[PDB]
Design a protein around this nucleic acid. Structure first.
Ligand SMILES: [Mg+2]
Ligand SMILES: [Mg+2]
Ligand SMILES: [Mg+2]
Ligand SMILES: [Mg+2]
Ligand SMILES: [Mg+2]
Ligand SMILES: [Mg+2]
Ligand SMILES: [Mg+2]
Ligand SMILES: [Mg+2]
Ligand SMILES: [Mg+2]
Ligand SMILES: [Mg+2]
Ligand SMILES: [Mg+2]
Ligand SMILES: [Mg+2]
Lengths: 354, 153, 61, 60, 107, 63, 50
RNA sequence: CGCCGCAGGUGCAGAUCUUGGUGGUAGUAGCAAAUAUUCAAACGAGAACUUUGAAGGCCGAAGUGGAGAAGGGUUCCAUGU
């Protein structure tokens, strides 16, 4: 009952600068994304800039931990999310016109500023990107503007997902199966108050019917797919894991215990990446994943050539209108769709704002 | 499901049922005849007294070898016992019956057990070992139970 | 990308054995992925590689 | 630790590991499991690290 | 008040007379629990482990003739229990049992 | 909750019988978390598991 | 016993391997007619042939 | 299925009949060989029986101890139900 929340105005201001530092590294990512680069190169430099910038901010309070709440995940045209290539793993080269999707997070006092964005690289100045890859990102952008407008204590959790299903049907697309938004509190990215998109019969009865509440942080995340809704595995190593503090077990391995203690020092409860270590890290992760000490964040692939897009950010709830601390660089001038919106409620929410 | 003795007014009635319950049929039949016609609160109190051995059930039909007790004199009888397992199983079915009565919306402070029936269930098989290389049955005697409670006051 | 015995028959003993070596290496990697979790794509490729090995050996014999 | 053919002896296992993974091996121990599969404990040479040989194999 | 405590002495010899050898010490604790139930009116009686050692001090059949105990009625502090009060009975080591009354004790 | 495994491992580590192994009644959860002999060693070092002394069999009367 | 021949140990291996429950997806097959492994064996109840 | 013919492995109360099922007996006989259990706590919906600690006892080194051969064949060991 003593857990910290947005009730402190100091918490508000450190949210604003933490979201600003998360937005500014996404900006450096999109300005440094060019043809002939590597996904691994952009991931390692994206996290390295986070580590040094969070070190130089809040140098006055260092009893706590400042750094990554979600590692720099970079995926292109085939991966849903949770992707961070290892040095021993194969790399990918960025070409002309491919849309790349970047996830990134910062945390201060265990309080999270999380943000993503989907953008096409090497975009010619003053041109229009079309096709079936240009409407999934525009629909997802409309989903993000929908959530920004409608997030308010007084609605239900199913209102968001039915609107997301509706805008999916309007754009002749569908949401990704089993994608969950979370209520983000102190030291937590896995809050119990969760939001579903593209549900099924099994996930619906396991989802909890709940009503929103004032003065709390959310991670509104939308996954829009131009295909059919298929996300599976293709034998790729899962890199991102999160410590589960509820459970414990007696490790039988010296290098697994060393791996776990390295997690406690750097990423004690928040999701991390195996890149930060690596030879013994790959050994020490398989046993800790076996006994559910770490929650794997698996990589998901769709049919080759299909297109999926993401848009997520941390939004603050307050009775006098919600506010945004994390935003991505999307411009609707150079992104249009071959299908427009036909629904009255959708056109009303995109017109109005806080 | 089709009971026997469907209620005269089904709106003011609730039903409960259990099948293949692993209690002795003979004990449960005697306990059911004890609580038949009782009020819901009175029967719940009575069954709790059976487990506390303050009130006994009279063994009227299945009484071969059943001992005598002083508490049998409340009934017009001489033999009585305190079947703990039969009382516990009927207590659970009475809780289920009153939960059904709440679900229908009719109040639970005026219910009376107007129907209660114990049927024999299919027998379960075990083995016992006897003197000269013989095997004999060790059959269990489970029972189905059904009950209907009707509002009356 | 499958292997057809009809196009195998023109090949020589050197490249036929090279193709057999490549298939056997792939199968051994698939068996590794089978015991290390892997994916259904790699699990279902086991039968494809196994029939390809038999196809090459039948052509050789 | 490898599961090997039940008809393979220590010399054959030692040569098979050397050829397939291009690594040296000090000694091979061998048991037959209760379910019938033969299991070999292939101790690598002192200069070969089994920790990273397991990586290039893919069983880390 | 219902958090009272009192010192009693129990004639264990009186309550165990006639019990067989292998059942004397177990019966002494059933009758000690009976004594606390009657004197304090609580169905929940907790024997102290030091009192259990005192009853079994001379073995299963040579139970002490008298024991000096202290019954303490207390609030269970837990409304999830169906009994509001429980009596905890402890062991009072004495050198003699002559002229020992039943007395009230402060906290 | 059920310290059968921990009592067996503590007797093997301490090289005594299960008669002489003293698991702490109050630290039940911490003992129960020890699924390994090295965890047992840590508890022995930290005083949560004690080897009780031999029952006294004096020869003073015989002497 | 601890001492055994290779033939005996291989015989015990097959009996061990086939003494397992049937898969759950077998019940979903078309025209299944199979309820449970009717050839299950317990060491204490039924002794092996050898 | 009726009628005209045809053909039988054609009619059951029995056979200490064959096979299957079900009663009374009957909530009965019984769950009585080798001294013995008790208190507190934990987990748990639920504890005479599980786990821990404290007692009181027994086996008493020809053991109710520690290991093996034959035989068994996974009963070994963790986790869960
Ligand atoms: Mg008679
Ligand atoms: Mg017998
Ligand atoms: Mg016999
Ligand atoms: Mg050998
Ligand atoms: Mg036998
Ligand atoms: Mg005939
Ligand atoms: Mg007949
Ligand atoms: Mg009897
Ligand atoms: Mg008896
Ligand atoms: Mg003795
Ligand atoms: Mg022995
Ligand atoms: Mg065992």
């Amino acid at each position: 009952q003593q857990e910290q929340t947005i009730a402190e105005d100091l918490v508000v201001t450190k949210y604003k600068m933490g979201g600003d530092i998360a937005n500014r590294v996404l900006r450096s990512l999109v300005e440094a994304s060019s043809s002939g680069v590597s996904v691994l190169s952009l991931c390692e430099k994206g996290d390295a800039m986070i580590m040094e910038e969070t070190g130089k901010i809040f140098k006055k309070e260092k009893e706590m931990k400042k750094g990554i709440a979600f590692p720099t995940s970079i995926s292109v045209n085939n991966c849903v999310c949770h992707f961070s290539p290892l040095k021993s793993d194969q790399d990918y080269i960025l070409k002309e016109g491919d849309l790349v999707k970047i996830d990134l997070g910062v945390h201060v006092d265990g309080f999270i500023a999380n943000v993503a964005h989907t953008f096409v690289v090497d975009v010619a100045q003053g041109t229009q990107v079309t096709g079936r890859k240009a409407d999934v990102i525009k629909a997802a952008h409309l989903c993000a503007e929908a959530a920004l407008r409608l997030v308010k204590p007084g609605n239900q959790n199913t209102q968001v997902t039915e609107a997301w299903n509706k805008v999916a049907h309007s754009f002749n697309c569908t949401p990704i199966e089993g994608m969950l938004s979370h209520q983000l509190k102190q030291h937590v990215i896995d809050g119990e108050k969760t939001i579903i998109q593209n549900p099924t019969d099994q996930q619906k009865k396991d989802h909890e019917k709940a009503e929103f509440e004032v003065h709390e942080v959310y991670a509104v995340d939308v996954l829009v797919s131009s295909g059919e809704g298929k996300a599976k595995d293709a034998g790729q190593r899962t890199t991102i894991y999160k410590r589960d503090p509820s459970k414990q077990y007696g490790l039988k391995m010296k290098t697994s215990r060393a791996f776990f203690s390295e997690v406690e020092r750097r990423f004690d409860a928040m999701p991390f990446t195996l890149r930060a270590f690596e030879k013994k890290a790959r050994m020490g992760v398989v046993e800790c994943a076996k006994h559910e000490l770490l929650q794997p964040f698996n990589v998901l692939y769709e049919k080759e050539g299909e297109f999926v897009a993401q848009f997520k950010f941390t939004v603050l709830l307050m009775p006098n209108g919600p506010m945004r601390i994390t935003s991505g660089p999307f411009e609707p001038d150079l992104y249009k769709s071959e299908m427009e919106v036909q629904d009255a409620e959708l056109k009303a929410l995109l017109q109005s704002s806080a | 499901v089709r009971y026997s003795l469907d209620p005269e007014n089904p709106t003011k009635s609730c039903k409960s049922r259990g099948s293949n319950l692993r209690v002795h049929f003979k004990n449960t039949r005697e306990t059911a005849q004890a609580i038949k016609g009782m009020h819901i609160r009175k029967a719940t109190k009575y069954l709790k007294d059976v487990t506390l051995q303050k009130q006994c059930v009279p063994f009227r039909r299945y009484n071969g070898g059943v001992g005598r007790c002083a508490q049998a004199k409340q009934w017009g009888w001489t033999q009585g016992r305190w079947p703990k397992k039969s009382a516990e199983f009927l207590l659970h079915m009475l809780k289920n019956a009153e939960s059904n009565a709440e679900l229908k919306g009719l109040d639970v402070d005026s219910l009376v057990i107007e129907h209660i029936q114990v049927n024999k269930a299919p027998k379960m098989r075990r083995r016992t070992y006897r003197a000269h290389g013989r095997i004999n049955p060790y059959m269990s005697s489970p029972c189905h139970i059904e009950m209907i409670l009707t509002e009356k006051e | 990308a499958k292997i057809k015995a009809r196009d195998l028959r023109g090949k020589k003993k050197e490249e036929l054995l090279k193709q057999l070596d490549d298939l056997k290496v792939e199968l051994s990697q698939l068996r590794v992925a089978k015991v290390t979790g892997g994916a259904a794509s790699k699990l279902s490729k086991i039968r494809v590689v196994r029939k390809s090995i038999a196809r090459v050996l039948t052509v050789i014999n | 630790v490898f599961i090997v053919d039940v008809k393979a002896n220590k010399h054959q296992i030692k040569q098979a590991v050397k050829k397939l993974y291009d690594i040296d091996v000090a000694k091979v121990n061998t048991l037959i499991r209760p379910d019938g599969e033969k299991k070999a404990y292939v101790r690598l040479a002192p200069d070969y690290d089994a920790l990273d040989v397991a990586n290039k194999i893919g069983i880390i | 008040n219902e958090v009272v405590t009192r010192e009693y002495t129990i004639n264990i010899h009186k309550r165990i007379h006639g019990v067989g050898f292998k059942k004397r010490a177990p019966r002494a604790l059933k009758e000690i629990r009976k004594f606390a139930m009657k004197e304090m009116g609580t169905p929940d009686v907790r024997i102290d482990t030091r009192l259990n050692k005192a009853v079994w001090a001379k073995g299963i059949r040579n139970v002490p003739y008298r024991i000096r105990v202290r019954l303490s009625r207390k609030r269970n502090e837990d409304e999830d229990s169906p009994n509001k009060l429980y009596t905890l009975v402890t062991y009072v080591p004495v050198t003699t049992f002559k002229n020992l009354q039943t007395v009230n004790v402060d906290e | 909750s059920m310290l059968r495994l921990q009592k067996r491992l503590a007797s093997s580590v301490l090289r005594c019988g299960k008669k002489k192994v003293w698991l702490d009644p109050n630290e039940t959860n911490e003992i129960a978390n020890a699924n390994s002999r090295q965890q047992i060693r840590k508890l022995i070092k930290d005083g949560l598991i004690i080897r009780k002394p031999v029952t006294v069999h004096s020869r003073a009367r015989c002497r | 016993s601890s001492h055994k021949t290779f033939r005996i140990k291989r015989f015990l291996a097959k009996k061990q391997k086939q003494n397992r429950p049937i898969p759950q997806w077998i019940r979903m097959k078309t025209g299944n007619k199979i309820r449970y492994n009717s050839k299950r064996r317990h060491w204490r109840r039924t002794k092996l042939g050898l």
